[PDB]
Design a protein around this ligand. Structure first.
Ligand code: HEM
Ligand code: 9IU
Length: 137
């Protein structure tokens, strides 16, 4: 289930983080706007940019912590506040996060593996709700 899935993702985190974040940027091309330097790049080109691998892995490092500290896929309000307040997220609306989680669930559904895609979908929804509550537009 959810907790095992955190262990699975952490076991190959660099490759899952890149592959899910590329899935997100390819499904929702307008989202590359937040990351100007990513425009006009193939997946392979992106995977060779230092910044890409480092920000993607740090996103997933913190996403897995937030998932790990959740009760029944409901994240801590303190984690939601941290995400809303980060000055790298000044731009962002819950829609940015909704789309990331749609791509993540899709990725899990398409994978050969017994990911608990329904739990991730609930986690995404509950995070978006927690982010709204903590004051994200
Ligand atoms: C659970 C979801 C997310 C987590 C845990 C998260 C976490 C982080 C972390 C830890 C950083 C600092 C990384 C660094 O600067 O090296 C960061 C930066 C950033 N995040 Fe997020 N993030 C999430 C979702 C999003 C989404 C959905 C977007 C945009 C659609 C986004 C856009 C950014 C941007 C633009 C930066 C800084 C720009 C840059 O790389 O120079 N984040 N995020
Ligand atoms: C996978 C991508 C493009 C990453 C998303 C978020 C951050 C912080 C760095 C880039």
């Amino acid at each position: 289930g959810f907790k095992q899935d955190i262990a699975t993702l952490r076991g190959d985190l660099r490759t899952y983080a890149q592959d899910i974040f590329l899935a997100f940027l390819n499904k929702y091309p307008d989202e590359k706007r937040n990351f100007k330097n990513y425009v006009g790049k193939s997946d392979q080109e992106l995977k060779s940019m230092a910044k890409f691998g480092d920000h993607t892995e740090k996103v997933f490092n913190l996403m897995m912590e937030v998932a790990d500290r959740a009760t029944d896929c409901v994240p801590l309000a303190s984690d939601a506040s941290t995400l809303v307040q980060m000055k790298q997220h000044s731009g962002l609306t819950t829609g940015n996060f909704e789309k990331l989680f749609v791509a993540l669930v899709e990725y899990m559904r398409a994978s050969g593996q017994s990911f608990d895609s329904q739990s991730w979908d609930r986690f995404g929804k509950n995070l978006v709700s927690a982010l709204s509550s903590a004051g994200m537009k």
